[model samples]
Target chain A: MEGVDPAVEEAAFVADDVSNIIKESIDAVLQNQQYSEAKVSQWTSSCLEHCIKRLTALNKPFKYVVTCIIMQKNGAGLHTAASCWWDSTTDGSRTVRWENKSMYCICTVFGLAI
Target chain B: MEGVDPAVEEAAFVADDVSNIIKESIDAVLQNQQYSEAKVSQWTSSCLEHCIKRLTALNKPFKYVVTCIIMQKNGAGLHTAASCWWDSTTDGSRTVRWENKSMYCICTVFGLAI
Candidate 1:
């Protein structure tokens, strides 16, 4: 079935909320910074960990997957594509691309209803 | 309930099968080539489409999400991390990393049960 009730609405995956969390996490760690090879691991882990904590804090009846990919900006090209074979109505995914002057950070969150 | 029957086992997500599909798909499209900005988009789209097609052909009672990310092999930096909140037993995720002389390709597949 589709989302048709208050309880369902409260439980639904809100992409905007996720986007904010992701954006905040990324900015919190990587704001106006250059991409350093030594710290990319820290950056990536921090982003994923914080995002997951905030997603769990929502307390929704869903499982969440948060992915963070950080790549340096050297005029090189990057392309990402995803296709899912899930119930499109209940399961949802959102990707937020945040780029500073020196690097590109892509955050993706997948919400799977339990 | 856990997988305890023939049908349930048959319908289960096989991480090995998905890994094979992902590895084969990435190689088929990006076999040991220099990172060509001109072909990155095609590479991403092609990998996703092919992976999804093959996954759908499996006829399992699960939905799969396949992601492809391509980056040049420069001395810059790249880091990726994923954290999921889901039924760990029935749902699974796999990542296959393939690299050549001048590029790096990461393929990830997430299987979510119906």
Candidate 2:
């Protein structure tokens, strides 16, 4: 590992890091207080792309996939969950939900060590 | 909460539950030990469907999105990470990596509570 990237060795994408990414990305997109069904797709794509970019910037030896979901907050309800089979210590996920009177946004990030 | 489905009220899509769904879906698909480039798409779709079915069976008021990645592990590296903006306590995700000498299979499931 002499030539390995030092950032990769030191980078630990833990739950806290994942949480922060979710929080920051959502805030960046929704801070304008604009929510509409027509804009759901755009908001999701932007948030996801930004999360992936930030995670990549960490220079970790990991491939990152980010997903974002934005939905109108009507009377309907939603429940989300996941299951994983991997090393519990190194690989994990973080989920954050942001909502206002009109809509709710949810994001989940999974980190797998290469 | 009256007249609501009892299952919906009782169903708690917690981390442990999500983890089980990921584990079971991956196990169901990879138990055959057959991994091929041609079959990657099929396997991913099948596993995803199985996960969604199981999540639906919980009868919770939630929508789920599942994603799977299958890669031949021939010295190639993969790093997967996700970030979500949602209620941390109620919504979550799970990722599972199943690997053998020839390949690596990674699956991520996201559940959002409405």
Candidate 3:
């Protein structure tokens, strides 16, 4: 255990850290706006881009997949589920559901150790 | 070299294969049916379960994550994007867009080498 450094946990996937990263990214592009048909695509791309940039900044020894969904809030029900077959010990996932009065933004991040 | 089999390909992630698995799973649950608030959650769960079962059946040396979304088609706009940071050589993803007369189903599967 001498070679292992327990104090440095930088290369690990912490769910709250990722959730915060995704929330910040979502707010950067979608702060206080209504979902527009013409602008939805732009907002989606910007969110994904910003998230990937920050995830890479984490520089963890893991592969990351980030997914985002932006939908206009109507009187409709949206349901989503994920089933993962993996080593639950080393690999994990996180989801953040952020919404405003007019729209909903859901993002999920998966971290698989390399 | 004799100790290593040529089957690194045997366990590698193939996009098309996973795509087919997801497509079949989506069709099994939402085929020729209109999206209803009452059954959307059940259908989504069934689809995810089925997809995960089949992906595990492949017996590949990879971890799998499958996500399903069943959206009621009421002229609402939806946009989704994914950005991946990983070894593109060994990891891959697939998305299937299947819709019938009444609803839209989008499914994504991500495979990461374990």
Candidate 4:
């Protein structure tokens, strides 16, 4: 029989509330689409807010990092992209195409079990 | 008078053609958006093409890294976003809103002076 993966085991222990908080934060970012680079500061602030809320509320022994990247579509396209490492455990990411606009938003949340 | 910032001096040393190559890669990504993740592969391919073309053409003694992130908005606003050590010498990023509707892309390029 195959043994359980440690990463999956750790994910099971993560607080449900923490998951909800992350979901909410991601939702908030996707909900708005004014498409201003200035607003990205505010959007990112909101992202940080939720990440902190979840991390603090859970009070779990884990380090979590949340990143949001918002861009206004000019005439340029995205180029080569890669991320070194996120986590081997309970980490998830979601991207949403906003309503009625020509822009996209991406959110990634990483949970490190400490 | 204060001497030139080391970072600025380094940027000036970069070839103009290298600058154009970077610019073109970004432009290619921004030019197309069909809202399919599959296309992102092609989009990102074009990105890598430009990045490689420039680095190889210039043949500068520098290591270059490029990253692109594309998202489909889903009612979530962006949350705290930050990148560490994006090279003080020569680093640039641009986000473009496409021509159609409801999609966005962001790209960042870092040139490390070797």
In order, the Cα lDDT scores of the candidates are 0.63, 0.54, 0.63, 0.47
**Predicted candidate 4 versus true structure: per-residue lDDT over B1-114, tens digit per residue:** 644321121122334654566556646654556546676556755665667666766666355555555544433343326422122433333332222244444444545443
Estimate, for each residue in A1-114, the C-alpha lDDT of model 2 and write its tens digit. 354221222223346665676567767755545655555656666778787777777745364446544434444333222333223332445445556554556566665453
Rank order (by DockQ, best first): 1, 3, 4, 2
* Candidate 1 wrongly placed segments (more than 4 Å): A1-16, A31-37, A112-114, B1-16, B30-37
For each candidate, the DockQ is 0.40, 0.07, 0.38, 0.13
Docking class of 3: acceptable
For model 3, residues A51-95, the per-residue Cα lDDT tens digits are: 888888987636776776665664554555556665655465665
Query: TM-score of chain B, per candidate?
Result: 0.68, 0.65, 0.66, 0.52
User: After best superposition, candidate 1 residue A22: deviation in angstroms?
Assistant: 2.6
User: lDDT by residue for model 2 over B1-114, one digit each (tens)?
Assistant: 454321222222337676677667766765545655555556666777777777778745365557665544435423223343223432445455555444556666656443
Task: Show where candidate 2 strays beyond 4 Å.
Answer: A1-16, A80-90, B1-114
Cα distance off (Å), candidate 2, residue B57: 22
What value does the lDDT take at residue A52 in candidate 1?
84
Instruction: Name model 4 segments beyond 4 Å from true.
Output: A1-19, A26-37, A74-76, A83-100, B1-114
The DockQ of predicted model 3 stands at: 0.38
lDDT tens digits by residue: candidate 1, A42-108? 7767778888888778866367777766656646455555656646544656665665445566667
Chain A TM-scores of each predicted structure, in the order given, are 0.68, 0.65, 0.67, 0.52
Please tell me which model should have the higher TM-score, number 2 or number 4.
2
